[PDB]
UniProtKB/Swiss-Prot annotation, chain B:
Gene field: RPS14B
Keyword line: Cytoplasm, Nucleus, Ribonucleoprotein, Ribosomal protein, Ribosome biogenesis, rRNA processing
Keyword rRNA processing: yes
Pfam families: Ribosomal_S11 (PF00411)
GO BP terms in the entry: cytoplasmic translation; maturation of SSU-rRNA; maturation of SSU-rRNA from tricistronic rRNA transcript (SSU-rRNA, 5.8S rRNA, LSU-rRNA); ribosomal small subunit assembly; translation
Protein name, per record: Small ribosomal subunit protein uS11B
Predominant place of localization: cytoplasm
Top-level taxonomic group: Eukaryota
Organism of provenance: Saccharomyces cerevisiae (strain ATCC 204508 / S288c) (Baker's yeast)
Quaternary state and interactors: Component of the small ribosomal subunit (SSU). Mature yeast ribosomes consist of a small (40S) and a large (60S) subunit. The 40S small subunit contains 1 molecule of ribosomal RNA (18S rRNA) and 33 different proteins (encoded by 57 genes). The large 60S subunit contains 3 rRNA molecules (25S, 5.8S and 5S rRNA) and 46 different proteins (encoded by 81 genes). uS11 interacts with eS1 forming part of the mRNA exit tunnel. uS11 interacts with snoRNA U3. uS11 interacts with MPP10. Component of the ribosomal small subunit (SSU) processome composed of at least 40 protein subunits and snoRNA U3.
Swiss-Prot record, chain C:
A family per Pfam: Ribosomal_L41
Protein name, as recorded: Small ribosomal subunit protein eS32B
Keywords: Cytoplasm, Ribonucleoprotein, Ribosomal protein
Region (Disordered): 1-25
Gene Ontology MF terms in the entry: structural constituent of ribosome
GO annotation, biological process: cytoplasmic translation
Function: Component of the ribosome, a large ribonucleoprotein complex responsible for the synthesis of proteins in the cell. The small ribosomal subunit (SSU) binds messenger RNAs (mRNAs) and translates the encoded message by selecting cognate aminoacyl-transfer RNA (tRNA) molecules. The large subunit (LSU) contains the ribosomal catalytic site termed the peptidyl transferase center (PTC), which catalyzes the formation of peptide bonds, thereby polymerizing the amino acids delivered by tRNAs into a polypeptide chain.
Location in or out of the cell: Cytoplasm
One GO cellular component term noted in the UniProt record for this chain: cytosol
Additional record remark: Present with 4910 molecules/cell in log phase SD medium.
Transmembrane region(s): none
Swiss-Prot record, chain F:
Domain of life: Eukaryota
This protein's encoding gene: RPS1A
One GO-annotated biological process of the protein: maturation of SSU-rRNA from tricistronic rRNA transcript (SSU-rRNA, 5.8S rRNA, LSU-rRNA)
Function: Component of the ribosome, a large ribonucleoprotein complex responsible for the synthesis of proteins in the cell. The small ribosomal subunit (SSU) binds messenger RNAs (mRNAs) and translates the encoded message by selecting cognate aminoacyl-transfer RNA (tRNA) molecules. The large subunit (LSU) contains the ribosomal catalytic site termed the peptidyl transferase center (PTC), which catalyzes the formation of peptide bonds, thereby polymerizing the amino acids delivered by tRNAs into a polypeptide chain.
Subunit structure: Component of the small ribosomal subunit (SSU). Mature yeast ribosomes consist of a small (40S) and a large (60S) subunit. The 40S small subunit contains 1 molecule of ribosomal RNA (18S rRNA) and 33 different proteins (encoded by 57 genes). The large 60S subunit contains 3 rRNA molecules (25S, 5.8S and 5S rRNA) and 46 different proteins (encoded by 81 genes). eS1 interacts directly with uS11 and eS26, which form part of the mRNA exit tunnel.
Keywords in alphabetical order: Acetylation, Cytoplasm, Isopeptide bond, Phosphoprotein, Ribonucleoprotein, Ribosomal protein, Ubl conjugation
Protein name, entry field: Small ribosomal subunit protein eS1A
GO molecular function annotation: structural constituent of ribosome
From Swiss-Prot, chain I:
Superkingdom field: Eukaryota
Name of the protein in question: Large ribosomal subunit protein uL2A
Organism: Saccharomyces cerevisiae (strain ATCC 204508 / S288c)
Subcellular location: Cytoplasm
Family: Belongs to the universal ribosomal protein uL2 family.
Subunit structure: Component of the large ribosomal subunit (LSU). Mature yeast ribosomes consist of a small (40S) and a large (60S) subunit. The 40S small subunit contains 1 molecule of ribosomal RNA (18S rRNA) and 33 different proteins (encoded by 57 genes). The large 60S subunit contains 3 rRNA molecules (25S, 5.8S and 5S rRNA) and 46 different proteins (encoded by 81 genes).
Additional record remark: There are 2 genes for uL2 in yeast.
Sequence positions bearing Phosphoserine: S57, S58
Function field: Component of the ribosome, a large ribonucleoprotein complex responsible for the synthesis of proteins in the cell. The small ribosomal subunit (SSU) binds messenger RNAs (mRNAs) and translates the encoded message by selecting cognate aminoacyl-transfer RNA (tRNA) molecules. The large subunit (LSU) contains the ribosomal catalytic site termed the peptidyl transferase center (PTC), which catalyzes the formation of peptide bonds, thereby polymerizing the amino acids delivered by tRNAs into a polypeptide chain.
Covalent crosslink: Glycyl lysine isopeptide (Lys-Gly) (interchain with G-Cter in ubiquitin): K17, K43
Length: 97, 127, 25, 91, 81, 160, 150, 97, 101
RNA sequence: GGUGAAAUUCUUGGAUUUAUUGAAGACUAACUACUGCGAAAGCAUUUGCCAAGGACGUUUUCAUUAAUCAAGAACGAAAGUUAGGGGAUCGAAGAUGAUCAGAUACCGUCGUAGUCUUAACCAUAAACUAUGCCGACUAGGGAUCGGGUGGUGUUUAUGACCCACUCGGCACCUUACGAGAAAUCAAAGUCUUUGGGUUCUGGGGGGAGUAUGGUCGCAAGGCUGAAACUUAAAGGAAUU
């Protein structure tokens, strides 16, 4: 049956948009469908920057940070990312916390 | 007071490149791979096999005059899959062992304004 | 089977009912 | 009446020579016998002279064009490519 | 809601109604007096106007048509008449 | 500079002639760094791009850009905050008037001097009052096309 | 129901309730016969003359200033055209787009509506023949369109 | 958009069509604002605008050619050059420049 | 000449050595593409219509654009006669009979 | 290089990383969303030109001009087909390194037709919202795009933003004492209290979209399309 209301892909009243391909398995999915997420990390390890960057004149220069936007798919998300199932009557929220 | 090289590592997947150059670019200095130091081919992504690569890279450069450097890292880059791996986090600490002089640590992974579609088929490389 | 490959078998015998039934006068 | 259904000009040849040896021809000489737009008057007064010569019956202007047209497909991209090139030296 | 008095409504409903769905439908536009800043005569231009009709002697400006109400936009008045 | 919070506006420098073991580079253009653009992108806002070709006092014909996102203004209730989308092709021609009209003119000793303290962005504060004020607007790139030839003459204005 | 596109709105007008109206106006009909025929030496576009007086003068409807509609007004003094008011504009839209179709010619999307609006050209034509406001059998083809619309 | 601007010249005043009737008018100054096509042979593109410089009138260069100026005046054949005699109620003669 | 053109242009009828008065790209509808200069060592690279490359000097002449009359191979000769009319103008190399005969 | 590991291949014929660049074709990322335009398939870089379309304002204009359609027509993603062009990337057919008792299957490197376009062609798809169009009623709310109105509102006359609205959109949420076999539903409601118009379709599964013709297509193939014989269930929904 119609196991979800908007069963696929957050798409009502337009038909078709374009596909955008997954990163690790490289399956093709339409960009409205599978997965949004931003993945900001950093660009340094555990820094210990007071003697990592005492060498760095113009002191520390950045607080350096990179941005990455990702596109998983349905068929590879539940083999890394921790959802893997949800029950019947709890599939309703949209904010992550 | 200082003189700046450009470290500019290449920590892609299944490899690790690192070579200081002049900022002119067309006078490079002493590239070193994941295959230079240790040989098992499992060791292309170990931490301590990635630190030895920048180890021989660093003290070879001080013998020429490279005191200060400009680290400006690079992942796979482009439509090649864009994310830093086990080298850029790890082997940059192997420039901290010399007390060598750092700066400007962000990436130059090139950005496709989407073009010339990827590989692995439409359906994707299922295992 | 799947109905994608039942249809492939019943489409490449229409190049046999069309061919050998035709010259058989 | 209608004369012929799908044969067209190739009733000239008749029963012989095959199908695709007559299909591929007949698309091409309708680009050869027929008139065009003479760009030096606007009127439809240009017809073939020879192997790649397209003269006009008025206006006395001859256009050296392709074999079965006055401007071919490969001829289209070069004339764009030339005034690509005239504004890396002028503008 | 189970009961009303549809023939005798309140007063704050008709302003929340439309041109086309009242009890007996009528317009929202209204004929309107403007005299020019220059001339003395009144041409009865109304604010839900069209193409920029102006006074017959000095046709400087009296109304500018928009997607909705045309406007006076300068000088004299609107009476409401 | 040493005034470090101009950590954006990356510069390439045309090295041209070696002036007797003290080689003095000539101007080439400007980039951003490759993440100051990306550190400004954000959902629920609107974007723009624009460009032109343009001459100068000589014919260093160059192709500048301009990017400008959209501010969350005061007293917002919506999250969206999107502009008109017919004003987008009304902002992108007026901003492509001012980035033109400073140039065609603007010698590379005064287009250079205008481009360092970002005088040009203050004009959009003062002339894009029309449709939306803006958030951060910058010029983001200048790259040449037609350096005429080697030009040993006018290079000598740049020295100590 | 809009019959050609999927709109549903009501963007129309609503005539006031009063017949006798508007209890302010000056001298009646006997100056307003030719006051619109005066403008009608300019052609004119006949349904447009109700809206060019209205935004300037109090004329509000043809029911108020005189007791006749502006077909029965305009025809009697010898003005009304052969193809009067809408089908003249509707085939003017038909002849305008076919000129566009003799150029670029790749428009499969834009000659779609020319098979759509010419289903409207025929429909209002054979209403006008049924009431015999236009004489029957009505030779209509887009070959001689510009000699018919002009 | 001067194509609508030419579409009311003909209904408001007097004009000519073709080559000879234009240069029939320039030799007594009754012409104003001759209009020129683009694929006219450039001898006669210049052979009339020489004396048009001498007969005080102004010139316009319509971007299309012979078979494009025909529809922008109302007729259904070619017209190379249009002189307009009087356009006393028209948005042309002052609106240029 | 091919030093007075910049890169990317599409020339034909150029000459191999300067003085040859046209030797290559003379056929019915071909072209030689310039595929790279160098200001010093004044010999330009080109792109010949079959798969070979070539280095010639900048003093080589050359017309711009593809030769007209091209695109004629598409119609079949399609009978014996108007193939026989074609060779009769050029040379005697027709009919070419076979070697197992 | 390459994956979990290994190699074909490329290697002191200087590769792979680099720097100054050019080209060549395809593609317009990041914004890009419970948002738009389009009849439907579809449509995201700038500008110009061409004509078109929905919405709203109306105290213009005609006065039943209308709904749904057999026959008959236009458009109609991808792969195809004919013949040209440019052939970067991917890449059925194929060859190859490994895995496999077994691989011409998955994986890895190469790779032809295609991919793009111009003239022409078939008319099929999960062409899905698995929900034929028109009309009129019956709950409450919050957002959202577009138009309009009104607010002594903010920002500095204008624009944007707020507020109260209103009309047409895409939907959503809360419930429905109604409907439904249930899942579910503002319509699948106003239906054994059994009638608002109108088009199309289906009668147990297999045989079978098959055979026979008709008919279209150059072709793959499409539309129309039975029967002999065989069997007592194939299915839908939710429970443990
Ligand atoms: Zn993937
Ligand atoms: Zn001619
Ligand atoms: Zn006035």
């Amino acid at each position: 049956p119609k196991k979800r209301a908007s069963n696929g892909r957050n798409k009502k009243g337009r038909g078709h948009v374009k596909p955008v391909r997954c990163v690790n398995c490289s399956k093709s999915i339409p960009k409205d469908k599978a997965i949004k997420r931003m993945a900001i990390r950093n660009i340094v390890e555990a820094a210990a920057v007071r003697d990592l960057s005492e060498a760095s004149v113009y002191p520390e220069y950045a607080l350096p940070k990179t941005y990455n936007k990702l596109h998983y798919c349905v068929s590879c998300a539940i083999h890394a990312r921790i959802v893997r199932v949800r029950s019947r009557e709890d599939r309703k929220n949209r904010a992550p916390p | 007071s200082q003189v700046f090289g450009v470290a500019r590592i290449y920590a892609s997947f299944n490899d690790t490149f690192v070579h200081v150059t002049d900022l002119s670019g067309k006078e490079t200095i002493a590239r070193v791979t994941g295959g230079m130091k240790v040989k098992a081919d499992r060791d292309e992504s170990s931490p301590y096999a990635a630190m030895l690569a920048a180890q021989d890279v660093a003290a070879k450069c001080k013998e020429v005059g490279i005191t200060a450097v400009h680290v400006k890292i690079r992942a796979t880059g482009g439509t090649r899959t864009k994310t830093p791996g086990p080298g850029g986090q790890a082997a940059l600490r192997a420039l901290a062992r010399s007390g060598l002089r750092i700066g400007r640590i962000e990436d130059v992974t090139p950005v496709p304004s989407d073009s010339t579609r990827k590989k692995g088929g439409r359906r994707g490389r299922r295992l | 089977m799947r109905a994608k490959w039942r249809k492939k078998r019943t489409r490449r015998l229409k190049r046999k009912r069309r061919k050998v039934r035709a010259r058989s006068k | 009446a209608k004369r012929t259904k799908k044969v067209g000009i190739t009733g000239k040849y008749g029963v012989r020579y095959g199908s695709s040896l007559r299909r591929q021809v007949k698309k091409l000489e309708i680009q050869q016998h027929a008139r065009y737009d003479c760009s030096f008057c606007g009127k439809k007064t240009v017809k073939r002279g020879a192997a790649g010569i397209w003269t006009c019956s008025c206006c006395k202007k001859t256009v050296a064009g392709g074999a079965y047209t006055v401007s071919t497909a490969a001829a289209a991209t070069v004339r764009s490519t030339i005034r690509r090139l005239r504004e890396m030296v002028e503008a | 809601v189970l009961v009303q008095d549809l023939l005798h409504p309140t007063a704050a409903s008709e302003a929340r109604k439309h041109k086309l769905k009242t009890l007996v439908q009528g317009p929202r536009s209204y004929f309107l007096d403007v005299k020019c800043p220059g001339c003395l005569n009144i041409t009865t231009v109304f604010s839900h106007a069209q193409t920029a009709v102006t006074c017959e002697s000095c046709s400087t400006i009296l109304c500018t048509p928009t997607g909705g109400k045309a406007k006076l936009s300068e000088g004299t008045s609107f009476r409401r008449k | 500079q040493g005034s470090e919070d101009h950590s954006f506006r990356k510069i390439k420098l045309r090295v041209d002639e070696v002036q007797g073991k003290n080689l003095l580079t000539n101007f080439h253009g400007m980039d951003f760094t490759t993440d100051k653009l990306r550190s400004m992108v954000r959902k629920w806002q609107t974007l723009i791009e624009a460009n032109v070709t343009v001459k100068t006092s000589d014919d260093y014909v160059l192709r500048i850009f301009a990017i400008a996102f959209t501010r969350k203004q005061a007293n917002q209730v919506k999250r969206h905050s999107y502009a008109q989308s017919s004003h987008i092709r009304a902002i992108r021609k007026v901003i492509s008037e001012i980035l033109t009209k400073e140039v065609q003119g603007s010698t590379l000793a005064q287009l250079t001097s205008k481009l360092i303290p970002e005088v040009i962005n203050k004009e959009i504060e003062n002339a894009t009052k029309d449709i939306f004020p803006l958030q951060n607007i910058h010029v983001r790139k200048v790259k040449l096309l037609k350096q005429p030839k080697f030009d040993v003459g006018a290079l000598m204005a740049l020295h100590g | 129901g809009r019959m050609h596109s999927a709109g549903k709105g009501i963007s129309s007008s609503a005539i006031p309730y009063s017949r006798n109206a508007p209890a302010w106006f000056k001298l009646s009909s006997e100056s307003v016969i030719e006051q619109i025929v005066k403008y009608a030496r300019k052609g004119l576009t006949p349904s447009q003359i109700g809206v060019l007086l209205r935004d300037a003068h109090g004329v509000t409807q043809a029911r108020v200033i005189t007791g006749n509609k502006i077909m029965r007004i305009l025809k009697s003094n010898g003005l009304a055209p052969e193809i009067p008011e809408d089908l003249y504009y509707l085939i003017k839209k038909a002849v305008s787009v076919r000129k566009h179709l003799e150029r670029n010619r790749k428009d499969k999307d834009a000659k779609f509506r020319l098979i759509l609006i010419e289903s409207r050209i025929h429909r209002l034509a054979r209403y006008y023949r049924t009431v015999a406001v236009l004489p029957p059998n009505w030779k209509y083809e887009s070959a001689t369109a510009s000699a018919l619309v002009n | 958009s001067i194509n609508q601007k030419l579409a009311l010249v003909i209904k408001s005043g007097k004009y000519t069509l073709g080559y000879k009737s234009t240069v029939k008018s320039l030799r007594q100054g009754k012409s104003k604002l001759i209009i020129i096509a683009a694929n006219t042979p450039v001898l006669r593109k210049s052979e009339l605008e020489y004396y048009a410089m001498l007969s005080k009138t102004k010139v316009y260069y319509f971007q299309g050619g012979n078979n494009e100026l025909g529809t922008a005046v109302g007729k259904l054949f070619r017209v190379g050059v249009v002189s307009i005699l009087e356009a006393g109620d028209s948005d042309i003669l002052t609106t240029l420049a | 000449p091919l030093g007075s053109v910049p890169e990317g242009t599409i020339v034909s009828n150029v000459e191999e050595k300067p003085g040859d008065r046209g030797a290559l790209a003379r056929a019915s509808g071909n072209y030689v593409i310039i595929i790279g200069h160098n200001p010093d060592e004044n010999k330009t690279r080109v792109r010949l219509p079959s798969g070979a490359k070539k280095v010639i000097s900048s003093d080589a002449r050359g017309v711009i654009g593809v030769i007209a009359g091209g695109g004629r191979v598409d119609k079949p000769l399609l009978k014996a006669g108007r193939a026989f009319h074609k060779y009769r103008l050029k040379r005697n190399s027709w009919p070419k009979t076979r070697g197992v005969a």
